[PDB]
Amino acid sequence: NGIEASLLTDPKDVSGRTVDYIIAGGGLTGLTTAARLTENPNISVLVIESGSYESDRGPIIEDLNAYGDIFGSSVDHAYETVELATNNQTALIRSGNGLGGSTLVNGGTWTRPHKAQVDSWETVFGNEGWNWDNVAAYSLQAERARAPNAKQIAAGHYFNASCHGVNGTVHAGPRDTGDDYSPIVKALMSAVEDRGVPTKKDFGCGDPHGVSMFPNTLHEDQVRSDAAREWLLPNYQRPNLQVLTGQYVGKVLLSQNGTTPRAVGVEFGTHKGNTHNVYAKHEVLLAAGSAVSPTILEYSGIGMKSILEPLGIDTVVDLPVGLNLQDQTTATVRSRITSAGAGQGQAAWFATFNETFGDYSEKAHELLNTKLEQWAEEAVARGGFHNTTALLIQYENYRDWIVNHNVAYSELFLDTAGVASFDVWDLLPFTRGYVHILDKDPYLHHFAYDPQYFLNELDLLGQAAATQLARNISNSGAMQTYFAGETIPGDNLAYDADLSAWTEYIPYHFRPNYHGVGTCSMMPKEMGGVVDNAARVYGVQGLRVIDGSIPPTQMSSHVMTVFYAMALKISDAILEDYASMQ
Amino acid sequence: GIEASLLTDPKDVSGRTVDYIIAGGGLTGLTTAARLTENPNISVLVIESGSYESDRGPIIEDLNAYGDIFGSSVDHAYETVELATNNQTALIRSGNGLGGSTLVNGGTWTRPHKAQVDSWETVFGNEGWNWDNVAAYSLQAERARAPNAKQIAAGHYFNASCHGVNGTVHAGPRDTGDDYSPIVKALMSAVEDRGVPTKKDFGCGDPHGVSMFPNTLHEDQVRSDAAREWLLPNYQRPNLQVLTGQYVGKVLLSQNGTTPRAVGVEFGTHKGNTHNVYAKHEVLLAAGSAVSPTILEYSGIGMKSILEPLGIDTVVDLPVGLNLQDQTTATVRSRITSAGAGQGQAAWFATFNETFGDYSEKAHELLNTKLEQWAEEAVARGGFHNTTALLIQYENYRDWIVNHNVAYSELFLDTAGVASFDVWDLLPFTRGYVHILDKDPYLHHFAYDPQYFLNELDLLGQAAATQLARNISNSGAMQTYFAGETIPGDNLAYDADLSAWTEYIPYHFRPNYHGVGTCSMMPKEMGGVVDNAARVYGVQGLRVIDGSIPPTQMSSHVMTVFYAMALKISDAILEDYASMQ
Ligand SMILES: *[C@@H]1O[C@H](CO)[C@@H](O[C@@H]2O[C@H](CO)[C@@H](O[C@@H]3O[C@H](CO[C@@H]4O[C@H](CO[C@H]5O[C@H](CO)[C@@H](O)[C@H](O)[C@@H]5O)[C@@H](O)[C@H](O[C@H]5O[C@H](CO)[C@@H](O)[C@H](O)[C@@H]5O)[C@@H]4O)[C@@H](O)[C@H](O[C@H]4O[C@H](CO)[C@@H](O)[C@H](O)[C@@H]4O[C@H]4O[C@H](CO)[C@@H](O)[C@H](O)[C@@H]4O)[C@@H]3O)[C@H](O)[C@H]2NC(C)=O)[C@H](O)[C@H]1NC(C)=O
Ligand SMILES: *[C@@H]1O[C@H](CO)[C@@H](O[C@@H]2O[C@H](CO)[C@@H](O[C@@H]3O[C@H](CO[C@H]4O[C@H](CO)[C@@H](O)[C@H](O)[C@@H]4O)[C@@H](O)[C@H](O[C@H]4O[C@H](CO)[C@@H](O)[C@H](O)[C@@H]4O[C@H]4O[C@H](CO)[C@@H](O)[C@H](O)[C@@H]4O)[C@@H]3O)[C@H](O)[C@H]2NC(C)=O)[C@H](O)[C@H]1NC(C)=O
Ligand SMILES: Cc1cc2nc3c(=O)[nH]c(=O)nc-3n(C[C@H](O)[C@H](O)[C@H](O)COP(=O)(O)OP(=O)(O)OC[C@H]3O[C@@H](n4cnc5c(N)ncnc54)[C@H](O)[C@@H]3O)c2cc1C
Ligand SMILES: Cc1cc2nc3c(=O)[nH]c(=O)nc-3n(C[C@H](O)[C@H](O)[C@H](O)COP(=O)(O)OP(=O)(O)OC[C@H]3O[C@@H](n4cnc5c(N)ncnc54)[C@H](O)[C@@H]3O)c2cc1C
Ligand SMILES: *[C@@H]1O[C@H](CO)[C@@H](O[C@@H]2O[C@H](CO)[C@@H](O)[C@H](O)[C@H]2NC(C)=O)[C@H](O)[C@H]1NC(C)=O
Ligand SMILES: *[C@@H]1O[C@H](CO)[C@@H](O[C@@H]2O[C@H](CO)[C@@H](O)[C@H](O)[C@H]2NC(C)=O)[C@H](O)[C@H]1NC(C)=O
Ligand SMILES: *[C@@H]1O[C@H](CO)[C@@H](O[C@@H]2O[C@H](CO)[C@@H](O)[C@H](O)[C@H]2NC(C)=O)[C@H](O)[C@H]1NC(C)=O
Ligand SMILES: *[C@@H]1O[C@H](CO)[C@@H](O[C@@H]2O[C@H](CO)[C@@H](O)[C@H](O)[C@H]2NC(C)=O)[C@H](O)[C@H]1NC(C)=O
Ligand SMILES: *[C@@H]1O[C@H](CO)[C@@H](O[C@@H]2O[C@H](CO)[C@@H](O)[C@H](O)[C@H]2NC(C)=O)[C@H](O)[C@H]1NC(C)=O
Ligand SMILES: *[C@@H]1O[C@H](CO)[C@@H](O)[C@H](O)[C@H]1NC(C)=O
Ligand SMILES: *[C@@H]1O[C@H](CO)[C@@H](O)[C@H](O)[C@H]1NC(C)=O
Ligand SMILES: *[C@@H]1O[C@H](CO)[C@@H](O)[C@H](O)[C@H]1NC(C)=O
Ligand SMILES: [Ba+2]
Ligand SMILES: [Ba+2]
Ligand SMILES: [Ba+2]
Ligand SMILES: [Ba+2]
Ligand SMILES: [Ba+2]
Ligand SMILES: [Ba+2]
Ligand SMILES: [Ba+2]
Ligand SMILES: [Ba+2]
Ligand SMILES: [Ba+2]
Ligand SMILES: [Ba+2]
Ligand SMILES: [Ba+2]
Ligand SMILES: [Ba+2]
Ligand SMILES: [Br-]
Ligand SMILES: [Br-]
Ligand SMILES: [Br-]
Ligand SMILES: [Cl-]
Ligand SMILES: [Cl-]
Ligand SMILES: [Cl-]
Ligand SMILES: [Cl-]
Ligand SMILES: [Cl-]
Ligand SMILES: [Cl-]
Ligand SMILES: [Cl-]
Ligand SMILES: [Cl-]
Ligand SMILES: [Cl-]
Ligand SMILES: [Cl-]
Ligand code: NA
Ligand code: NA
Ligand code: NA
Ligand code: NA
Ligand code: NA
Ligand code: NA
């Protein structure tokens, strides 16, 4: 009778029962893991998701070109930040609410980071086995990519088959609306070539640099490949896979009768006073998203006493939950185009530090070479992190990425389809923020989410330089043929604005990038981490965090390719322990 | 207890029939539910999206915690369109739970100018909706307490003939127990120097000058939210049912007659798992001004130009969702000397000329010459459909200003350690809209556009009022306590002229969350949606009874009027019930 009829909506169907694994959150990592675990018919899984099934709704979900129309609806959590210090305004964090999580609402861009960035998760953040070669293999295993056709190659696509899986689960291929592709993509490529910048690198191969087109998470018929469509719809008839919709996981139930606390279940519901319990024989897996999974821990008594004590919550395990939050800032440059520029197409410039800063490179490098210690002390003073020595290790890692590997530092993302529009973000922010609960009741959803955008001076300078670069390249070389006047900033910022003018403009003309990671960072406890290299929360048995909370660093890429691989890798660790616990 | 009496399972009501269904358990919905169920033979089902919150603790029960609840599950936080004035989205605070926005509001208890309510009868053709009648219902709803000697010494003045003392809604002076700040009387002295009156009782029908006021709280200072006042005393009535946690999606219509009839509602939280419940007598929409019009549109009641592109058959064509009127608010904040310490709030209800000062000649010239152009422009933006009809509203406002000299702006003072003004133009000429953007009610995909500052007088008036708040903060007796401005502070030069304020204000304001008018109570020929008994035109058994229906803004805080509105509509409903038996 279809997937919808298989979904559970009544809490009484699971209340008081025991399953092998409970997954809080039916998003990208939650549904990937639920599918992987239920391949064994003897493993029972219950997914609890706050939203519902959305993959069949229609174009607002299924058409990637409708991106953004869903914002503000019931399928968007729209988490509100604190009043940001940079501009004394509240910001909204777009985040998908429904089966598939933010894969229901995202831009569909399918790229991978730089090899050195993933390698550092093992060599710097002490996560044995978390290196590019290992993670990339899981990524290719998840991937079901389609090579571009002659039309798509002619528009600018380049596909290196050795960097892609073709027999996996997540359908990926070129976006193709059916119309001609705009010549502006190739014009951007020519414009950066004039400056010695590479083009047409395959951004799945481990060196994202230059201007390239890329695959998207959609089927060949252009239907969005959201994680529910890819991982749940093919498998919903499995009797060992249960999915409860419309309910929030409030906290993890802990048993302290043993020598170490153990997660034995969860409480779920929609309002205080009408909750229900469900129990896990093996493990509870938190996958509610980087903004939520840390709060679930705090409501459970897992977090910093300085936070929990004033709220009346006993601290069962003291950990720096909710710190080390890393999101990027995004600004827009938009220009009208000539009729000859018409057509579809997206592309992105993954720009190095020196490409981003141009003639300011020397001054920017001087800051990078002298201020890391002071920046770390200040971020710690602002509550973004607790241990300055540990944070400095992160900053030195970023310096190594920039100076020794020349990784991409900013992304200039081009949309065409009738205009020339760049969304631009500094990929490697040095600011660190936090998320903390403000009340003991999980169902009040009263929390403080503060990414601390632009409170590090290099983040502001880098964003300003990258956005200025987007204006520059929009009217340089071959792009001049198609340029027909800037509309954003337009009248809001003089066209000849220098870098200092951009730095004054940017704090009042940016949005969150909604790429937040790090709130339950996977790194050693002594470095400020919350989970080990198998995603297990320190000091608690049978509890893991498996979502975007755990990446300890940002990366020069869009994260789906890594997060699918992440979930598969953690799933293998879960299954290994399951076999031992028999 | 009340919590155990509340329904949460849709199967408890699915497929059943009651006499009245009320969509929304907020201020007007719960007042009406209480009035209707006083007759034990009348059954009422309230369907509310939130739950019971009145016992949660200080975040709800302490008016001094105002604002802490924002962004939580008790705040709908409706997002606007990208506003044209600043290319930013704004958040509309709106209470989600039993009591609606009375759970989250500032508690201010004041009434408008007699001439404003009178115009509802003389300009907007609502027989019986005049000050004398509406105020009588307001006093009937009210249970006011006179100020004591400490509260009078701080600046309170209470005219007992303007207040009911045997009603339902507990109201009296806010009193935290601390000393009252001398700054309230300093503000009174500062405006006295300029010929402005003070200590008028803002409940008597002439809101003008600087006065203190009652708050909606009990003597022990617990918030008098509408659930505490109208539901908690009466929840044991078996004919009163309250379903929580569910959204009313649309009204079920029967076109079996010559005119459509409301026979029930569909409710739920997600497409594909909906439920029906039926009304023997009437469906009453009370989901708030941002929502009740969308429920009509989802039901096929609204403008074909909006409904047809979404695939919704227009059953009754009406200008639903137009005529949205909300105000803009800006802040001026200054530190105080230690001698200014203490509790206390006050408000300056300022006339047009008090607001504009030396710009009064300039502002009046605009008001006298551009009303027709402005009305055309608002209509072109989709805030209204009929320019001639909108011009009647504009001339009504002009009459209020020039002939009755009603208050045009409000400068609301908070102390308690600072001197902070929230300032808003009370009478915006801009008109906005709210329209659904999808056929699925449970997707909550809508376009809410108050069109802030898209009328040039609204921007000039806001700028002038906010500049006035800075001015009065450092004038006369207020100088004794001034210890430096913090907002705007460094963000706007302290000597800024009016033009500088007009460029600053679009980037430093918030919605006031007083939106009304989206189902305006006025003749169909004037663009109205409901008649003088709140009945939707062209539909039988359907009313809108909430903040959607006031056709104008008013120089006051609206609770006093909305409680009265609910009682008055309740009488009409019950008279029809009795006459039809
Ligand atoms: C976001 O919004 C926030 C506001 O919410 C905003 O932050 C405010 O910014 C404004 C500036 O616009 C700033 O206001 C100035 O404050 C000056 C006073 O310095 C402070 O003194 C305070 C009082 O000290 C006494 O009381 C306290 C408490 O009782 C005691 O602890 C003290 O011991 C003492 O007894 C202190 O509270 C305060 O410390 C705070 O700030 C520091 C930050 O460094 C922080 O570490 C600490 O924790 C505290 O929070 C600090 O010492 C005052 O001098 C300024 O007045 C000048 O300017 C105004 C405005 O133009 C004029 O009215 C005055 O007349 C005066 O003018 C003189 O200087 C002008 C130049 O500016 C010149 O033109 C003129 O001719 C004169 O020479 C001013 O009022 C305020 O303090 C900030 N913080 C707060 C909480 O309000 C923030 O910037 C916004 N961000 C964005 C991006 O927009
Ligand atoms: C909210 O955000 C919107 C955008 O989403 C924004 O509206 C846009 O504003 C910009 C200005 O900031 C507008 O762009 C300008 O448009 C005119 C052309 O407009 C006419 O013609 C077009 C078709 O050609 C029609 O569609 C339109 O309706 C009008 O009839 C151009 O003249 C402008 O270009 C000049 O300035 C640019 C930026 O500085 C230059 O790059 C360009 O070369 C031109 O520059 C200069 O030319 C000479 C060279 O020096 C010199 O004489 C002058 O310096 C001149 O500037 C510019 O592109 C845009 O149309 C608006 N609408 C849209 C949909 O984009 C809102 O303003 C914004 N609101 C707020 C409050 O921020
Ligand atoms: C606007 C936007 C655009 C993006 N664009 C791209 C792009 O172009 N390319 C790319 O690669 N990535 C993109 N992403 C990133 C990608 O979508 C996310 O990083 C990924 O979906 C995160 O997966 P996750 O499992 O950590 O969380 P999510 O996928 O967010 O899943 C978390 C789930 O938990 C649910 N939930 C929340 N609270 C609770 C609770 N208390 N109980 C139960 N369930 C709960 C949520 O409703 C959601 O279903 C974008 C993200 C956003 C927000
Ligand atoms: C921040 C703020 C401050 C205010 N301060 C003051 C003040 O100081 N003084 C004053 O007099 N007034 C004040 N008010 C105004 C007052 O609170 C409101 O005008 C009044 O509460 C409106 O009553 P209503 O019945 O129209 O709607 P509400 O009281 O908002 O009731 C609407 C109810 O419907 C529910 N609902 C929504 N959608 C649905 C649906 N689809 N199905 C079912 N239920 C639904 C809501 O959750 C809510 O309970 C303030 C308002 C706000 C927002
Ligand atoms: C980016 O520009 C910077 C600054 O101009 C260059 O940095 C210098 O590189 C030389 C050669 O390695 C070093 O000896 C200097 O100490 C560097 N200066 C600073 C301030 O760090 C850098 O070479 C450029 N990088 C690329 C890839 O072109
Ligand atoms: C702060 O973080 C640093 C870096 O992770 C920790 O320093 C390590 O401490 C252990 C145990 O004392 C030593 O064996 C290591 O040699 C230290 N490493 C470095 C690089 O200095 C430190 O323990 C943390 N301290 C606190 C209080 O959290
Ligand atoms: C408000 O101010 C207006 C404009 O300053 C006053 O009306 C003006 O009054 C003067 C003096 O009598 C006349 O010369 C002008 O022609 C009037 N102008 C207009 C446009 O009407 C008005 O009297 C003031 N109102 C109050 C109540 O003080
Ligand atoms: C537009 O609104 C105006 C104002 O209500 C309506 O104009 C009235 O039209 C009726 C019927 O033709 C006349 O009896 C009135 O005298 C008009 N009043 C005025 C003041 O001019 C007009 O009908 C409305 N248009 C629509 C389509 O309803
Ligand atoms: C605060 O406002 C008052 C009144 O608007 C200002 O004093 C006025 O100054 C103007 C300009 O010279 C004169 O037309 C008025 O007659 C003055 N009014 C009085 C009562 O004397 C005062 O200057 C303003 N304060 C600041 C700092 O701008
Ligand atoms: C394709 O990818 C493989 C693996 O990264 C690499 O060895 C090979 O040279 C690539 N081919 C091209 C043409 O870049
Ligand atoms: C952008 O152009 C300006 C003006 O030519 C130049 O000074 C600046 O360095 C450019 N930015 C970059 C990153 O190249
Ligand atoms: C109270 O207000 C009424 C109504 O406006 C008025 O007639 C009366 O004079 C006032 N009484 C006092 C004592 O101020
Ligand atoms: Ba490709
Ligand atoms: Ba396919
Ligand atoms: Ba370089
Ligand atoms: Ba095109
Ligand atoms: Ba609790
Ligand atoms: Ba991404
Ligand atoms: Ba009083
Ligand atoms: Ba007070
Ligand atoms: Ba006129
Ligand atoms: Ba539908
Ligand atoms: Ba009309
Ligand atoms: Ba009000
Ligand atoms: Br495209
Ligand atoms: Br009086
Ligand atoms: Br009392
Ligand atoms: Cl489908
Ligand atoms: Cl759709
Ligand atoms: Cl932006
Ligand atoms: Cl149900
Ligand atoms: Cl039924
Ligand atoms: Cl509380
Ligand atoms: Cl009564
Ligand atoms: Cl008195
Ligand atoms: Cl009873
Ligand atoms: Cl400004
Ligand atoms: Na450059
Ligand atoms: Na919110
Ligand atoms: Na308020
Ligand atoms: Na009375
Ligand atoms: Na106005
Ligand atoms: Na009417």
List chain A residues with CB under 8 Å of B440. Answer: 57
Nearest residue on chain A to B68, alpha-carbon basis: A446
| Burial grade of B127 (CB within 10 A; 0-12, 13-18, 19 or more) | exposed
> Which residues are CB-contacts of B301 (< 8 A; sequence separation ≥ 6)?
B251, B315, B316, B318, B320, B536, B539
The 8-class DSSP code of residue A77 comes to -
- Tell me how the structure was determined: X-ray
Dist. CA A47–CA A26, nearest whole Å = 6
Protein residue with its CA nearest to atom 5 in ligand 7: B361
- CB atoms inside a 10 Å sphere around CB B404: 15
CA of A113 to the centre of ligand 10 (A): 16
Q: How many distinct helices (H) and strands (E) make up chain A? A: 17, 20
Q: Are residues B47 and B157 in the same domain?
A: no
Looking from the CA of residue B405, the nearest atom of ligand 7 is: 27
As a whole number of angstroms, the distance between CA B526 and CA B534 comes to 15
In a domain, A340, yes or no: yes
Ligand 1 binding pocket includes B495 (Cβ within 6 Å): no
Cα separation of A408 and A114, whole Å? 8
As given in the structure block, the two tokens for residue A289 are: 């998203």
A192 lines ligand 11 (CB under 6 A): no
Burial label, B521 (beta-carbon count in 10 A; 0-12, 13-18, 19+): buried
State the resolution, in angstroms: 1.7
Do B295 and B267 sit in the same domain of this protein? yes
**Which parts of B156-260 are beta strand (E)?**
169-171, 209-211, 240-243, 247-254
**Gap positions in chain A, given as the residue before each gap (C–N > 2.5 A)?**
none
Cα dihedral angle (B347, B90, A516, A102), rounded to 10 degrees? 140
State whether B91 and A80 contact (CB < 8 Å): yes
Q: What's the half-sphere exposure (Cβ side, CA atoms, 13 Å) at B211?
A: 27
How is B235-265 classified by DSSP, letter by letter? TT-TTEEEE-S-EEEEEEEE-SSSS-EEEEE
Same domain, B316 and B399: no
- Report residue A173 as tokens: 């291929």
Could you tell me the CA-to-CA distances from A314 to A299, A302, A308, A440, B39 in Å, in that order? 10, 9, 7, 10, 50
Of A81, A88, A85, A225, the C-alpha closest to A143 is A225
Gap between the Cα atoms of B302 and B518, Å rounded: 11
Task: State whether A74 and B442 contact (CB < 8 Å).
Answer: yes
**Mutation probe of ligand 11 site: the residue of A349, A355, A359, A360 with most atoms within 8 A of C-beta:** A359
Is B270 within 8 Å of A78 when comparing Cβ atoms?
no
Label each residue of A554-580 as H, E or C: CCCCCCHHHHHHHHHHHHHHHHHHHHH
| Beta partners for residue B324, in sequence order | B432
In angstroms, the CA A515 to CA A523 distance is: 19
Size of interface A-B (CB pairs under 8 A): 62
Helices B131-141 & B559-580, crossing angle to 10 degrees?
Answer: 100
Give the span between the Cα atoms of B101 and B98, in whole angstroms.
9
CATH value at residue B244: 3.50.50.60
Residue B399 shares a structural domain with residue B532: no
Distance of alpha carbon B566 from alpha carbon B545, whole angstroms: 7
Do B247 and B367 have their domain in common? no
Give chain B's count of helices (H) and strands (E): 17, 21
Distances (CA, A) of A533 to A7, A117, A119, A142, A518: 33, 16, 14, 20, 14
Q: Which of B8, B71, B507 sits opposite A80 (nearest CB)?
A: B71
Contact between B245 and A270 using a beta-carbon 8 Å cutoff: yes
| Helices A115-123 + A132-142 axis angle, to 10 | 120
Residues B49 and B119 in one domain: no
A278 is a domain residue = no
For ligand 8, whether the C-beta of B47 sits within 6 Å is no
**Residue A499 to chain B, least CA–CA distance (Å):** 21
Count of structural domains, chain B: 2
Distances (CA, A) of A462 to A367, A393, B119, B252: 11, 21, 58, 56
- Residue A93 falls inside a structural domain: no
Two structure tokens written together for B219:
């003597």
* Residue nearest (by alpha carbon) to ligand 7 atom 7: B361
- Quote the CA–CA distance of A99 and B201 in Å, as a whole number: 55
Domain of B12 in residue numbering reads as: 1-107+225-323+434-447+514-550
Query: Does B272 contact A4 at a Cβ distance shorter than 8 Å?
Result: yes
Task: Answer yes or no: do B286 and B377 share one domain.
Answer: no
Residue A102, annotated as binding a ligand? yes
Nearest Cα neighbor of A408 from A211, A140, A273 is: A211
- CA atoms of A536 and A530, how far apart (whole Å): 8
Question: For residue A137, what is the domain's CATH number?
Answer: 3.30.560.10
The beta strand positions in A270-304, using DSSP E, are 275-286
Provide the CB-side half-sphere exposure for A251 (13 A, CA): 22
Listed in sequence order, the residues at least 6 apart from A92 whose beta carbon sits closer than 8 Å to its beta carbon are A78, A79, A80, A81, A512, B79, B89
Determine whether the interchain pair A78/B79 forms a contact, defined as Cβ–Cβ distance below 8 Å. yes
For residues B48 and B38, state if they share a domain: yes
Cβ < 6 A, ligand 5 pocket = A 354, 361-362, 365-366, 369, 406
Q: Label residue A5 exposed, middle or buried (CB < 10 Å: 0-12, 13-18, 19+).
A: exposed
The strand pairing partners of B184, in sequence order, are none
- Shared domain for B161 and B237, answered yes or no, is no
CA distance A53 to chain B (A): 9
Q: How far is A445 from chain B (nearest CA, A)?
A: 5
Give the containing element (helix H, strand E) for A487: strand A483-488
Q: Give the integer Cα–Cα distance in Å for B322 and B325.
A: 9
Q: A190 lies in a domain?
A: yes
Same domain, B158 and B11: no
Of A52, A73, A444, the CB nearest to B72: A444
Element of type H or E holding A253:
strand A248-255
Residue B67 Cβ inside 6 Å of ligand 1? The answer reads no
Judgement on whether residues B406 and B391 belong to the same structural domain of the protein: yes
- Evaluate: CB of B286 within 6 angstroms of ligand 4: yes
Is A425 contained in some domain? Answer: yes
Among A169, A160, A154, A126, smallest CA distance to A34 is for A169
- The whole-angstrom separation of Cα A9 and Cα B549 is 36
The span from the CA of B54 to the CA of A98, in Å, is 30
Burial class (CB in 10 A: 0-12, 13-18, 19+), A158: middle
Helices assigned H by DSSP within A160-310:
184-193, 227, 293-299, 305-308
The answer to whether residues B120 and B113 touch, using CB atoms and an 8 Å cutoff, is no
| A102 min Cα distance to partner chain B (Å) | 16
Query: Which of B139, B152, B159, B162 has the most ligand 12 atoms within 8 A of CB, as the residue to mutate?
Result: B159
Question: Alpha-carbon distance B29 to A86, whole Å?
Answer: 41
Q: Which two tokens stand for residue B389?
A: 């009809």
Do the domain assignments include residue A570?
yes
Q: Which among B77, B269, B445 has the least Cβ separation from residue A246?
A: B269
Contact A327, A455 (CB under 8 A): no
B121 and B210 fall within a common domain: yes
CB A529 within 8 A of CB A523: yes
Q: Quick check: is A260 in a domain?
A: no
The torsion angles phi and psi of A471, rounded to 5 degrees, stand at -60, -45
3-state helix, strand, coil in chain A (%, to 5): 35, 20, 45
Question: What is the Cα–Cα distance from B33 to B101, expressed in whole angstroms?
Answer: 17
The verdict on whether residue B14 carries a ligand-binding annotation is no
Nearest-angstrom CA–CA distance, A364 and A372: 12
The pair of three-digit structure tokens given for residue A564, joined into one six-digit string: 């699918």
Q: Is A155 among the domain residues?
A: yes
d(CA A365, CA A402): 10
Q: B72 vs A9: CB contact, 8 Å cut-off?
A: no
Burial of B192 (0-12, 13-18, 19+ CB in 10 A): middle
Tell me if B459 sits within 8 A of B507, measured CB to CB. Answer: no
The minimal CB distance from A446 to the residues B72, B440, B442 is found for B72
Task: List the one residue out of A27, A70, A543, A32 whose CA is nearest residue A301.
Answer: A543
The residues of A annotated as belonging to the active site are 515
The nearest CA of chain A is from the CA of B443 a distance in Å of 5
Q: Which residues of A touch B (CB under 8 A)?
A: 4, 9, 52-53, 57, 60, 70, 72-75, 78, 80, 90, 92, 245-246, 270-274, 439, 443-446, 508
Q: What is the 3-state secondary structure (H, E, C) of B69-93?
A: CCCCCCECCEECCCCCCCCCCCEEC
Tell me if A249 is assigned to a ligand binding site. yes
d(Cα A291, Cα B110) in Å, to the nearest integer? 41
